[PDB]
Amino acid sequence: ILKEPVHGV
Amino acid sequence: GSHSMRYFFTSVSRPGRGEPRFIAVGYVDDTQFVRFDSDAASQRMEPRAPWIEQEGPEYWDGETRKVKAHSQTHRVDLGTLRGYYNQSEAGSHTVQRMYGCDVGSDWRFLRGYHQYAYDGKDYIALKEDLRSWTAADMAAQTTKHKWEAAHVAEQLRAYLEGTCVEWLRRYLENGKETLQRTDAPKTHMTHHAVSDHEATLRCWALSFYPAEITLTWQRDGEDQTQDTELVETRPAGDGTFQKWAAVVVPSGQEQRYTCHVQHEGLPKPLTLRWEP
Amino acid sequence: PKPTLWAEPGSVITQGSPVTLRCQTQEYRLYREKKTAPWITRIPQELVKKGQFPIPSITWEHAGRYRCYYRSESSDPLELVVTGAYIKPTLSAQPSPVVNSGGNVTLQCDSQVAFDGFILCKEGEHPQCLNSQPHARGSSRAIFSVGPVSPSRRWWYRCYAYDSNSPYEWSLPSDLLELLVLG
Amino acid sequence: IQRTPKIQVYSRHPAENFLNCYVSGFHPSDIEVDLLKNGERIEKVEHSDLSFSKDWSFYLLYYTEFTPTDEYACRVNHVTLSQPKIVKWDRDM
Numbered sequence A: 001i002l003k004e005p006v007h008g009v
Numbered sequence B: 001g002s003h004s005m006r007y008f009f010t011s012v013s014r015p016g017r018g019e020p021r022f023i024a025v026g027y028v029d030d031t032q033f034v035r036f037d038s039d040a041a042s043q044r045m046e047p048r049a050p051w052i053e054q055e056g057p058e059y060w061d062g063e064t065r066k067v068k069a070h071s072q073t074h075r076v077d078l079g080t081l082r083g084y085y086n087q088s089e090a091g092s093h094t095v096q097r098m099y100g101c102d103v104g105s106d107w108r109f110l111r112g113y114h115q116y117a118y119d120g121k122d123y124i125a126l127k128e129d130l131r132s133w134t135a136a137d138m139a140a141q142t143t144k145h146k147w148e149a150a151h152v153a154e155q156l157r158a159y160l161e162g163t164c165v166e167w168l169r170r171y172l173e174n175g176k177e178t179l180q181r182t183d184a185p186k187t188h189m190t191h192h193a194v195s196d197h198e199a200t201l202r203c204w205a206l207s208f209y210p211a212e213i214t215l216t217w218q219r220d221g222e223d224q225t226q227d228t229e230l231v232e233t234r235p236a237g238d239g240t241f242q243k244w245a246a247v248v249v250p251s252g253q254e255q256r257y258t259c260h261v262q263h264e265g266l267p268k269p270l271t272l273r274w275e276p
Numbered sequence C: 001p002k003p004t005l006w007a008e009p010g011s012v013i014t015q016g017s018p019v020t021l022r023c024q025t026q027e028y029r030l031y032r033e034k035k036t037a038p039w040i041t042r043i044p045q046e047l048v049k050k051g052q053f054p055i056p057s058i059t060w061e062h063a064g065r066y067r068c069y070y071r072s073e074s075s076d077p078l079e080l081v082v083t084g085a086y087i088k089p090t091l092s093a094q095p096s097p098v099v100n101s102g103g104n105v106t107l108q109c110d111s112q113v114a115f116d117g118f119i120l121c122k123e124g125e126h127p128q129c130l131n132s133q134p135h136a137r138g139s140s141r142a143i144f145s146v147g148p149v150s151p152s153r154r155w156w157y158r159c160y161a162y163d164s165n166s167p168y169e170w171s172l173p174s175d176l177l178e179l180l181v182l183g
Numbered sequence D: 001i002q003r004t005p006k007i008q009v010y011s012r013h014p015a016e017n018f019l020n021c022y023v024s025g026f027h028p029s030d031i032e033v034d035l036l037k038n039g040e041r042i043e044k045v046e047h048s049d050l051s052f053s054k055d056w057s058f059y060l061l062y063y064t065e066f067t068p069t070d071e072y073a074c075r076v077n078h079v080t081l082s083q084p085k086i087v088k089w090d091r092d093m
Helices: B057-084 B138-150 B157-174
Strands: B003-012 B021-028 B031-037 B094-103 B109-118 B122-126 B189-193 B198-203 B214-217 B245-250 B258-262 B270-273 C006-008 C019-022 C029-032 C052-055 C064-069 C078-080 C082-086 C090-094 C098-100 C105-110 C117-122 C141-146 C156-163 C166-171 C180-182 D006-011 D018-026 D032-037 D058-065 D072-077 D085-088
Touching: B003 B057, B003 B157, B021 B057, B021 B157, B031 B057, B057 B094, B057 B138, B094 B157, B109 B157, B122 B138, B198 B214, B214 B245, C006 C078, C019 C078, C082 C156, C090 C156, C105 C117, C105 C156, C117 C141, D006 D072, D006 D085, D018 D032, D018 D072, D032 D058
Parallel strands: C082 C166, C098 C180
Antiparallel strands: B003 B021, B003 B094, B021 B031, B094 B109, B109 B122, B189 B198, B198 B245, B214 B258, B258 B270, C006 C019, C019 C052, C029 C064, C064 C078, C090 C105, C105 C141, C117 C156, C156 C166, D006 D018, D018 D058, D032 D072, D072 D085
């Protein structure tokens, strides 16, 4: 699956 | 034995031309199983493997909210990045980002990884302990700070050793015949003529998986190397892979040669002998 | 009795353009080392007779070494260079395009494409070059010491980017960099 | 730091089908790939999803069905090639 949350640089 | 599920993300700004394009692609080893593409009529994360096909809504709903999320967070990084570098509007830029986790011959985790890069250049990767970062680049700490700080390497360290590996195993099962099985390399040999004195000898290897593999020439049991063209292991286009290693040989001496092939899908490594 | 192998207008043709090879009986063989060149086999016998091997719109495919013979002996090698395939690199004069009459200087063919080999040819009358490599590792920027100059002659240049893994495959030449010799 | 792509015009299987143009190790992504028969761009050009390596250089795959029968080649124009690099399918590379 997908990691979350994804963070902005 | 060992396996690995990992993701690829790539947003690429296109000034004027509306919003930047975003692409997400998933792999378990060398088998693609999901994808995203802001330009496709789908607007949803899509299945590319029979074994992921068998995942109910809960899955495809979630994966879309998350890719979407990813789809967005990068969209901004793209300009945020452009700031850190102060770059004009007229001119595209590419933000990449890959991450995945591997597992030893026991499916109990080997290692996790998470890297980022702006414009085909390493930007900030996650150190191997998965608690620290490596911001190779000056105003790349601006993100290193926001992260080593906000504690991402923390709850990200939880994903890699957690959910990541867990789902990697779930997939490994649902896709036993595809994922855990191999496709030995079908091989043959071509002999093109160069001239009166020389002639090339090429050793092929088609329709095989994993894409991992080695190919070498042994003239009289003396491996050759720098003088051996070696195309990158290329995608057959049907899940399998092909690769060939050719060598320029003295015309009338081919019999001396033997091709050597190694591949997880081969019990003993095969030693193809040009002239038996 | 090996013959003379040349080209017209000669080798180093900018892609898209045309070039022709030549030799010296009536028996004429031609071959590209390291890997056959199929275009040769397509030349009408109506040419081999005379020993003429034409190229309409030259492309990297051709690019490579070539020899001539017929049995006899192989002619001296002919280095066929295709140019203007890849994007152009930028030519700079470190640190001033302006040097005093009589002085060593420094040219710097910098490139935006990842490449590992460069050439520098004085355009000012035929072109005469010099090959070079990148001193940095992540960098694809080559350097050339030059001169010593003098006003008694115009030192103008252009450069090329190529990948060692296809040498007869060059980039477009850079904009002509004219030098300014004083005193 | 841009970079031309590694081109490979090859068939899924040998003469005894599908036509592949494999562009790899290239950067930026923005790329143009066309499959062509005797010179005419082929329609229905199918492709892989964009992806890349460790060094970040992308890699793609355009493929169409066909037969080893007429000329064949792959047209390609990146932002690294002034004009489209074409590549004829060598039955044997």
